[PDB]
């Protein structure tokens, strides 16, 4: 999908709730890499 | 532009790292080229009879020498947008040893081209790079303009692969 609007209605509708969760889950400096659950469109 | 429900920036077609071909070059410089005279005259569909790599080479080969390494930015950009075959890159690189005026300014053109293409067919690309290293050892001299600076192929190839930005276009690390 790198290179339909009706399907992007809700996806574009809530961007920032994803910014919240992601910025909330930041790997802490004592943790190399963090596996995380993801709900994607 | 396109009328309905979307506006497509430039052509932005095809392939080359899963997103788009024209994304390799910034919007500002890309629109400087697409708004430049040379691009609208000697290139694209009406000049090249649609996308044609060999006639695209007819333009650059057709161009003391007047062409200095604007025109280079443009011809490189159309090389990008057309995106010919890596095999054709191999031939165009290694053929025609019976004439010395053929690859003159084509060297750094086919070079910066593959420099923009991909970062790691893979082994063939690596052979292309090490061959470009051999030509960096070939001790060649050329002139370049934006000011005026003459630079040696050994300095521009090594300084280019080691350097982030080249003549305004950024590069990634292979």
């Amino acid at each position: 999908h790198s290179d339909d609007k009706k399907a992007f209605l809700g996806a574009l509708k809530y961007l920032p709730h994803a910014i919240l969760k992601l910025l909330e889950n930041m790997p802490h400096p004592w943790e190399q890499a963090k596996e995380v659950k993801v709900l994607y469109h | 532009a396109v009328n309905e429900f979307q506006v497509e920036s430039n052509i932005s077609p095809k392939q080359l790292n899963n997103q788009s071909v024209s994304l390799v070059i910034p919007r500002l410089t890309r629109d400087k080229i697409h708004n430049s005279m040379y691009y609208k005259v000697n290139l694209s569909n009406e000049s090249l009879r649609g996308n044609t790599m060999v006639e695209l080479l007819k333009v650059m080969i057709g161009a003391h020498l007047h062409m200095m390494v604007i025109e280079f930015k443009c011809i490189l950009m159309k090389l990008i947008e057309i995106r010919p075959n890596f095999q054709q890159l191999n031939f165009l690189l290694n053929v025609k040893n019976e004439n010395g005026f053929d690859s003159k300014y084509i060297i750094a053109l086919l070079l910066v081209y593959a420099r923009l293409q991909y970062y790691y067919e893979n082994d063939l690309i690596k052979l292309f790079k090490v061959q470009l290293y051999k030509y960096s050892q070939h001790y060649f001299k050329l002139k370049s303009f934006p000011e005026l600076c003459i630079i040696h192929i050994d300095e521009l190839v090594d300084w280019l692969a080691t350097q982030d930005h080249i003549w305004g276009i950024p590069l990634g690390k292979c």
Binding site: - | S47, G50, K96
Partner: protein, 109 residues
């Protein structure tokens, strides 16, 4: 009068083709550079930039070339004769064509 009411209700062309195809010669209509010339775009203004395909003349360069890059001018250019503008690479393209680029390049040089 009746005819009026009804209306209300070669090789040189190939040379013209050879002109409007190669731009390097077409690029320059500016040979006058800075010069004073004494005398709805249709059938030419007797000045400006000449497009014979659609019979329009354009006072500026970006309009003359931009119109040429436009589809309609290409559609008319094709409807004149053929469709080369729309016209793979099975290696014979760069082998034979590229070899013709070296050969013709040496011929010109």
């Amino acid at each position: 009068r009746e005819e009026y009411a009804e209306q209300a209700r070669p090789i040189e062309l190939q040379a013209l083709k050879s002109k409007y195809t190669n731009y390097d010669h077409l690029i320059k209509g500016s040979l006058k550079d800075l010069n004073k010339r004494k005398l709805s775009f249709k059938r030419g203004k007797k000045f400006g930039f000449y497009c014979d395909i659609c019979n329009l003349t354009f006072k500026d360069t970006l309009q003359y070339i931009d119109h040429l890059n436009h589809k309609v001018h290409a559609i008319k250019f094709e409807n004149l004769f053929d469709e080369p503008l729309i016209i793979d690479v099975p290696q014979e393209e760069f082998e034979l064509c590229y070899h013709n680029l070296i050969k013709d390049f040496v011929e010109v040089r």
